[PDB]
Amino acid sequence: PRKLVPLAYKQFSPNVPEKTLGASGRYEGKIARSSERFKELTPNYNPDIIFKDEKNTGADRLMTQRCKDRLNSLAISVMNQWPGVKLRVTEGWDEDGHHSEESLHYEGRAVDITTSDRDRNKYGLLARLAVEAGFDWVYYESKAHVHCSVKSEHSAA
Numbered sequence: 538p539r540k541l542v543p544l545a546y547k548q549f550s551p552n553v554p555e556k557t558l559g560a561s562g563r564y565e566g567k568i569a570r571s572s573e574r575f576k577e578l579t580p581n582y583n584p585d586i587i588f589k590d591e592k593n594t595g596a597d598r599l600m601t602q603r604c605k606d607r608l609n610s611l612a613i614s615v616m617n618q619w620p621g622v623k624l625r626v627t628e629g630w631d632e633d634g635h636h637s638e639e640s641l642h643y644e645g646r647a648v649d650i651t652t653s654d655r656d657r658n659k660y661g662l663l664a665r666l667a668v669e670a671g672f673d674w675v676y677y678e679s680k681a682h683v684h685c686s687v688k689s690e691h692s693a694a
């Protein structure tokens with residue numbers, strides 16, 4: 538076994554920009570509810586993940602399959618790491634534009650996460666778990682959350 542080292546505040550892994558091929562790839566444009574690419578999104582109803590749903594639309598559950606797969610892996614790891622605690626998503630797909638111009642939140646490929654107990658002391662390690670769970674980019678973005686993202690299925694040629 539290897540010792541798990543938490544990410545530092547503001548650290549990202551891999552240590553390259555989010556939208557590079559070695560990380561989460563490219564911004565492929567906003568997905569609107571009315572758009573064809575809306576079917577790229579699938580709702581995650583994993584019983585072991587808490588969704589904040591702060592906008593009361595259920596949008597934070599809607600994500601790509603790869604995002605769902607990595608998130609579900611992380612959900613198991615979080616429960617393992619801190620028995621009694623669960624993975625919590627505070628932001629997923631954003632229909633409103635509350636991030637930078639080319640956010641992967643706009644296309645259901647990024648989540649902001651915490652632990653269910655909102656213990657900010659856990660977030661560095663939570664970030665490390667997200668890396669081990671196979672998220673393509675993980676960024677300890679604020680003291681209040683970790684930003685995790687995935688590649689699309691449109692770069693493999």
Ligand SMILES: [Zn+2]
Pocket residue numbers: 628642647648649683684685
């Ligand atoms: Zn984010």
